[PDB]
Amino acid sequence: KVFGRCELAAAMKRHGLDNYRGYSLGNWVCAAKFESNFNTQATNRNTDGSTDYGILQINSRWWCNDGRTPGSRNLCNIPCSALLSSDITASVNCAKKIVSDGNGMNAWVAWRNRCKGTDVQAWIRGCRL
Ligand SMILES: [Cl-]
Ligand SMILES: [Cl-]
Ligand SMILES: [Cs+]
Ligand SMILES: [Cs+]
Ligand SMILES: [Cs+]
Ligand SMILES: [Cs+]
Ligand SMILES: [Cs+]
Ligand SMILES: [Cs+]
Ligand SMILES: [Cs+]
Numbered sequence: 001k002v003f004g005r006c007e008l009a010a011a012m013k014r015h016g017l018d019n020y021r022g023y024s025l026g027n028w029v030c031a032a033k034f035e036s037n038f039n040t041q042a043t044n045r046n047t048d049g050s051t052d053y054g055i056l057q058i059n060s061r062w063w064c065n066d067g068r069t070p071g072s073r074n075l076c077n078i079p080c081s082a083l084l085s086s087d088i089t090a091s092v093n094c095a096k097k098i099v100s101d102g103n104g105m106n107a108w109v110a111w112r113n114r115c116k117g118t119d120v121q122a123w124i125r126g127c128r129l
Contacts, residue, residue: 026120054083
């Protein structure tokens with residue numbers, strides 16, 4: 001599924017991400033924009049053999065099982081395919097664990113490089129939420 005911006009903002013809010021760990025909704029929407037372009041089906045191979053999955057590009061070394069990532073811990077206890085679903089619940093539940101891992105949203109390099117410090121409220125501007 002390719003979400004619209006406000007549609008994804010609403011779905012994220014519906015799943016408890018607004019201000020989760022202190023990160024406002026616009027931070028999450030911004031991260032999803034630059035990780036996946038709002039496409040739940042996005043997958044991208046990393047240099048190290050792991051793969052990133054879904055709206056928030058969650059990896060298979062630490063967080064989900066894809067069966068092909070040596071050393072996989074599967075800390076979200078889910079198949080990586082579950083992170084490609086139209087229903088963002090699994091991606092949200094796992095993201096909540098990731099952002100609680102110690103470094104906040106810096107876990108997403110694209111958030112650090114493209115969202116952090118910016119006017120992230122712009123991502124929710126105009127949205128009926
Ligand atoms: Cl915001
Ligand atoms: Cl933090
Ligand atoms: Cs909070
Ligand atoms: Cs990647
Ligand atoms: Cs990525
Ligand atoms: Cs990690
Ligand atoms: Cs596990
Ligand atoms: Cs940790
Ligand atoms: Cs960490």
